Amino acid sequence: AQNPNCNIMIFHPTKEEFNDFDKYIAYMESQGAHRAGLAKIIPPKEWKARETYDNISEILIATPLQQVASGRAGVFTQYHKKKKAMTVGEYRHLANSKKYQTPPHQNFEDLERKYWKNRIYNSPIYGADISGSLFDENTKQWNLGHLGTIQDLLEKECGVVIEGVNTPYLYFGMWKTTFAWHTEDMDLYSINYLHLGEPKTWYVVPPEHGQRLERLARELFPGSSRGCGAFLRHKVALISPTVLKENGIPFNRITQEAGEFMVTFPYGYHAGFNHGFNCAEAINFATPRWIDYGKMASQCSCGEARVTFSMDAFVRILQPERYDLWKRGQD
Numbered sequence: 001a002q003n004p005n006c007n008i009m010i011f012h013p014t015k016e017e018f019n020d021f022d023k024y025i026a027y028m029e030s031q032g033a034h035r036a037g038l039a040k041i042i043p044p045k046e047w048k049a050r051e052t053y054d055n056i057s058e059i060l061i062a063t064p065l066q067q068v069a070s071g072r073a074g075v076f077t078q079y080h081k082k083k084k085a086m087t088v089g090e091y092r093h094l095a096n097s098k099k100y101q102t103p104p105h106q107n108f109e110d111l112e113r114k115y116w117k118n119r120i121y122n123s124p125i126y127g128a129d130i131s132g133s134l135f136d137e138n139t140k141q142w143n144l145g146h147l148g149t150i151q152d153l154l155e156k157e158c159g160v161v162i163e164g165v166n167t168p169y170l171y172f173g174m175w176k177t178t179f180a181w182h183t184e185d186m187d188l189y190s191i192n193y194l195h196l197g198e199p200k201t202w203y204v205v206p207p208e209h210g211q212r213l214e215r216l217a218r219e220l221f222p223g224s225s226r227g228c229g230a231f232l233r234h235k236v237a238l239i240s241p242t243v244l245k246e247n248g249i250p251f252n253r254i255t256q257e258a259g260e261f262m263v264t265f266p267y268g269y270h271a272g273f274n275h276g277f278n279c280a281e282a283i284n285f286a287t288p289r290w291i292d293y294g295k296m297a298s299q300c301s302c303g304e305a306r307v308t309f310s311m312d313a314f315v316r317i318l319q320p321e322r323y324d325l326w327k328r329g330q331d
């Protein structure tokens with residue numbers, strides 16, 4: 001069995017190996033990458049997402065989200081308070097302000113310590129979940145706006161044509177902006193490219209151990225657990241590395257820098273934080289190996305998790321028994 005300790009693997013494809021996305025994902029899995037839940041891909045040196053980032057300041061962040069924490073330093077929830085619209089140029093200025101900027105630090109490890117010690121006492125603003133792309137239309141390799149769609153994968157594997165579309169999202173981050181512990185909708189893969197700016201630190205639990213994290217989460221967030229049998233689908237709960245170590249939950253950590261891709265694998269729980277002003281682009285995708293995870297994915301039916309148009313068909317076709325109850329939650 002390849003990669004049996006479920007370590008995060010880092011790949012350095014050549015320009016020749018960067019041509020066929022599906023084939024390279026399948027190569028990574030042949031080496032065991034998926035067992036970690038997360039992999040890093042450093043693009044060939046010849047490759048670029050686009051020529052420059054000089055003309056992005058007029059992109060609008062229609063609903064910036066203020067991430068307000070409750071709890072204790074190592075075990076907290078966050079809620080998202082909607083703020084007034086602002087442009088990317090306005091947001092970057094805010095991120096760089098004395099109130100919001102990255103503090104002086106020695107290295108990534110010192111910054112990680114400061115994040116866990118102090119996150120809860122501040123409410124950073126995240127420009128998350130913005131439909132769009134920063135890939136140049138002429139970039140032919142690993143262009144997250146030109147991937148094969150999940151609807152076409154389901155059709156190719158299962159023979160059923162379904163409605164729905166699959167497009168990327170932009171994330172504009174600042175110091176302490178946070179992504180809570182989650183897997184993807186329908187336990188899909190995701191791919192994330194850090195276009196510019198400061199790093200993003202990731203934590204991940206191997207897929208084979210996801211239920212261990214769920215059991216800990218039910219213990220640490222007991223009201224939330226009673227409210228919903230899949231409450232980590234709400235994407236609001238944080239648990240520190242110190243707490244995970246104290247409770248024997250297997251995980252790994254890695255920092256992504258500008259110019260690098262990350263892939264999350266089916267049922268790979270992940271969480272993390274941004275180091276300073278940055279812009280990432282991400283999208284879900286599927287492979288043939290995903291189908292069985294989609295069939296087994298938990299669902300939120302309490303009504304909190306509220307998701308895309310396109311998830312309807314996935315539930316309907318892969319989880320017909322759950323369909324009725326899940327749709328009541330969506331309506």
Ligand SMILES: O=C(O)CNC(=O)C(=O)O
Binds near residue numbers: 171178280
């Ligand atoms: O970058 C973020 O805020 C969150 N991204 C993801 O969870 C992902 O790419 O799967």
Ligand SMILES: [Mg+2]
Binds near residue numbers: 055056057059
């Ligand atoms: Mg612009």
Ligand code: NI
Binds near residue numbers: 183
């Ligand atoms: Ni994710």
Ligand SMILES: [Zn+2]
Binds near residue numbers: 305
């Ligand atoms: Zn729920």
